[PDB]
Design a protein around this ligand. Structure first.
Ligand SMILES: *[C@@H]1O[C@H](CO)[C@@H](O[C@@H]2O[C@H](CO)[C@@H](O)[C@H](O)[C@H]2NC(C)=O)[C@H](O)[C@H]1NC(C)=O
Ligand SMILES: *[C@@H]1O[C@H](CO)[C@@H](O)[C@H](O)[C@H]1NC(C)=O
Ligand SMILES: *[C@@H]1O[C@H](CO)[C@@H](O)[C@H](O)[C@H]1NC(C)=O
Lengths: 232, 254, 106, 228, 55
């Protein structure tokens, strides 16, 4: 039996605006007699399970709950917890989700690193990283789009945030894209977007291309004309 | 008696600090002209450091005869301590890069020829400065004894970070030279106006970096803040032996 | 002692003019028409839209500057672009900060 | 009562320069007549538990043993036996560990990446990343050396091997290190040693420097004129 | 026609080194490189050196 609880995502509030949140139990027998009571310092639960995913490859069970709680109430930090009402479980386990007050908040300094010279020379698929440095401990959602076309998340992998070696407070992350050598050879630009707090609109974008992927040619044609002119 | 506080090549990092004249024109040629091929053991390395200390002592003795000698020699020992320990600031000098490039050979050989109960303790570090400091602290007592031959207890300013010590030489030098300044008046007056303006902006530029109260620098500042009852002061109150904080420094002529 | 005739901040031109006088002699004054230009070498044709190629040519017809499109940012004026964000089947377009170093509230 | 035995990995062997074995007992408090011994599959007692570990108060016994002499025999995959015997239990409890077989041994291909120009311009701190990738077994130990000395494990951070989507058997990883801007403008060298089973020498080094990334040509065509 | 890349080992005392040439992670055949035996340094008392060339 694997039990996990997911707080609402920072990219779910910003994009979907519906504060979905639940605690999940998986790899256990299905009984279809579960309604997870939620505690707001009170016993009432606003909503029961809907669109619950009972179907599993191993015929195991899962639980899905949803609610709507004010954003300022979450900012206050009340100890919302979920109580399982599974008939199989004799003792209902207590799982509490609440972000503490006073957590650090800072903006992600996103730098994009061009691929290595050696990998392109070897004539196979390149790899491009999207470094995210110093962002707040909240989980961040990042995706990759090329020339404004949102790519599928199937071929890039993101790393869970880890404590920064230099700063005990801040965090960092990574994300890599594998693309064909001829695509990067043609010079198509690629963009990385971050979605985290402490920003004017909570979204930052950076991009490079072959002509800006640590190049060797600076083809400048500085062509100043009409130098004398007339002015006052 | 000039400090040459402009950037130039005095200090690589962009913050302004005024180098003391005692750092400039030192007899560092003994360590400068070392032969890493002929030296591979701790015992041979100690002798040359003792020789360099003796040369520094006689250099200061000859310089002064062209308590104050004791103070200058004290800070010179601290400076040589910083040179040996490898945490010195004067990276810009082309001569002083070679010394910190060829002591690496000696201490790498020493770290290579070590035994297991110390190898695991000194395995991890950067530029071998951990066991460099360990070697200094092991052989610190003998070096000052060889230095003090010209003209006891081991000095304590060598653990002090270099920037605050540089402030201390500045305080001693400025009080000494203002005592030297004075002891009709129209002839003398115009030089004092030039005396102020040659060092007028010398005080203000460092004060802007006294904020944020290096890795090891902050811990000493935090600990001294807990004591001495004066945590945040632009004046350290260490060996000032005169008035401080702009009281008689500026526009005292009128 | 000089007056900035043209200070186009999106082209970075800083044309000045000074009068340096010869000493203890009649007037053989020489006129400084100083010019200072700081090229990007990495900014694109679109100063804001980042999916454009680089700009190599740096045409400065100073007749126009003395009296469209330009290549140097300005610090006070904030720039903006809109990108599509996908959480799944749906999408939502939210504008970004191309220069967030000086665009967050202060 | 329960006994858990885990074998050492490549990182432990590389860092400790020896083979250490654990035959650890869980949920068992301090009693008398507790016997733990590691014996050869052939039958002989290759090594005893000299300097036995003190029992943890919270029902945990370590009981670790060193097969230091047989470095290659562990790599051969020969099975090891742990003998756990107590008075209450009639049948002695046995723990068996061995090297797995059948896995692929694709080689890593490290590519060390210099810091970005935007990070360098802010003049705060550069972060050099070491994108180890391609290894088929999921065991990699990465250290950083500057002028022939391993850097402290505080300064760098290693991420766990993450599965690679393009190929099933392969994996990848990464690590970062926070170099100061001054010490990188000085132009020093940093090395990313990777330790893996599949490497024929079992170690590989790479080097980066300020001079690693520089442009070649600067063709400028100043076309100053007076008439448009 | 040909090139002769050298590999100047130096400074080692215990007289035993192994020199091997790898191209793209695959070791080169031993028929290409020719390794010189350790010979003492002229200006160093007890530290040897060696060479290795590749055609
Ligand atoms: C490239 O430059 C053109 C103008 O030279 C720009 O087009 C408009 O720019 C304004 C500036 O704020 C935007 O508000 C408009 O939305 C842009 N037009 C369109 C159709 O988006 C723009 O910077 C670039 N062109 C495009 C098509 O993005
Ligand atoms: C370099 O610039 C010249 C003149 O502007 C142009 O003719 C040439 O095609 C350019 N080459 C490259 C590789 O950009
Ligand atoms: C560099 O620029 C010149 C014109 O200034 C151009 O003729 C030349 O082709 C450029 N170099 C390359 C490699 O394209």
């Amino acid at each position: 039996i694997r039990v996990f609880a997911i707080p609402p995502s920072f990219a779910s509030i910003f994009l979907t605006k519906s504060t979905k949140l639940t605690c999940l139990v998986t790899d256990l027998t299905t009984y279809d007699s579960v309604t997870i009571s939620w505690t707001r310092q009170n016993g009432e639960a606003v909503k029961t399970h809907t669109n619950i995913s009972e179907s599993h490859p191993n015929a195991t069970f899962s639980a899905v709950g949803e609610a709507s709680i004010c954003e300022d109430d979450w900012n206050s930090g009340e100890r919302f917890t979920c109580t399982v009402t599974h008939t199989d479980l004799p003792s209902p386990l207590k799982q509490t989700i609440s972000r503490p007050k006073g957590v650090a908040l800072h903006r992600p300094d996103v730098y994009l690193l061009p691929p290595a010279r050696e990998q392109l020379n070897l004539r196979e698929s390149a790899t491009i990283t999207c470094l995210v440095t110093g962002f707040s401990p909240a989980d961040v959602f990042v995706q990759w789009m090329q020339r404004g076309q949102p790519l599928s998340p199937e071929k890039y992998v993101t790393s869970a945030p880890m404590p920064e070696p230099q700063a005990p407070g801040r965090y960092f992350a990574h994300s890599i894209l594998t693309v064909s050598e001829e695509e990067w050879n043609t010079g198509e630009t690629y963009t990385c977007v971050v979605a985290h707090e402490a920003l004017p609109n909570r979204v930052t974008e950076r991009t490079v291309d072959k002509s800006t992927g640590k190049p060797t040619l600076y083809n400048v044609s500085l062509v100043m004309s009409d130098t004398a002119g007339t002015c006052y | 008696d000039e400090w040459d506080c402009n950037k130039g090549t005095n200090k690589l990092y962009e913050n302004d600090i005024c180098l003391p004249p005692r750092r400039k024109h030192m007899c560092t040629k003994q360590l400068e002209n070392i032969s890493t091929a002929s030296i591979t053991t701790t015992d041979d390395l100690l002798k040359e450091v003792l020789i360099t200390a003796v040369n520094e002592g006689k250099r200061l003795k000859q310089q002064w005869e062209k308590h104050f000698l004791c103070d200058a020699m004290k800070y010179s020992f601290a400076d040589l301590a910083d040179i040996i320990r490898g945490t010195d600031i004067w990276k810009g000098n082309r001569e002083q890069q070679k010394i910190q490039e060829r002591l690496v050979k000696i201490f790498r050989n020493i770290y290579d020829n070590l035994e297991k109960d110390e190898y695991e303790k000194y395995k991890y570090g950067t530029k071998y400065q951990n066991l460099r400091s360990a070697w200094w602290d092991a052989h610190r007592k003998k070096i000052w004894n060889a230095m003090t031959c010209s003209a006891k207890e081991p000095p304590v300013y060598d653990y002090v970070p270099q920037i605050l010590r540089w402030i201390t030489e500045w305080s001693e030098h400025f009080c000494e030279l203002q005592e030297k300044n004075y002891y009709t008046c129209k002839t003398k007056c115009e030089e004092y106006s030039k005396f102020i303006k040659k060092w007028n902006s010398q005080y203000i530029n460092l004060e802007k970096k006294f904020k944020e109260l290096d890795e090891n620098l902050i811990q000493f500042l935090q600990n001294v803040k807990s004591e001495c009852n004066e945590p945040n002061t632009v004046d350290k109150y260490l060996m000032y032996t005169s008035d401080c904080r702009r009281v008689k420094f500026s526009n005292t002529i009128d | 002692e000089r007056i900035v005739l043209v200070d186009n901040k999106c082209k970075c031109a800083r044309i000045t003019s000074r009068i340096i006088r010869s000493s203890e002699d009649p007037n053989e004054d020489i006129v400084e028409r100083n010019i200072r230009i700081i090229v990007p070498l990495n900014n694109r044709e679109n100063i804001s839209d980042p999916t454009s190629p680089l700009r190599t040519r740096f045409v400065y017809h100073l007749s126009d500057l003395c009296k469209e499109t330009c290549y140097t940012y300005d610090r006070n004026k904030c720039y903006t672009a809109v990108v599509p964000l996908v959480y799944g089947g749906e999408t939502k377009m939210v504008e970004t900060a191309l220069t967030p170093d000086a665009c967050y509230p202060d």
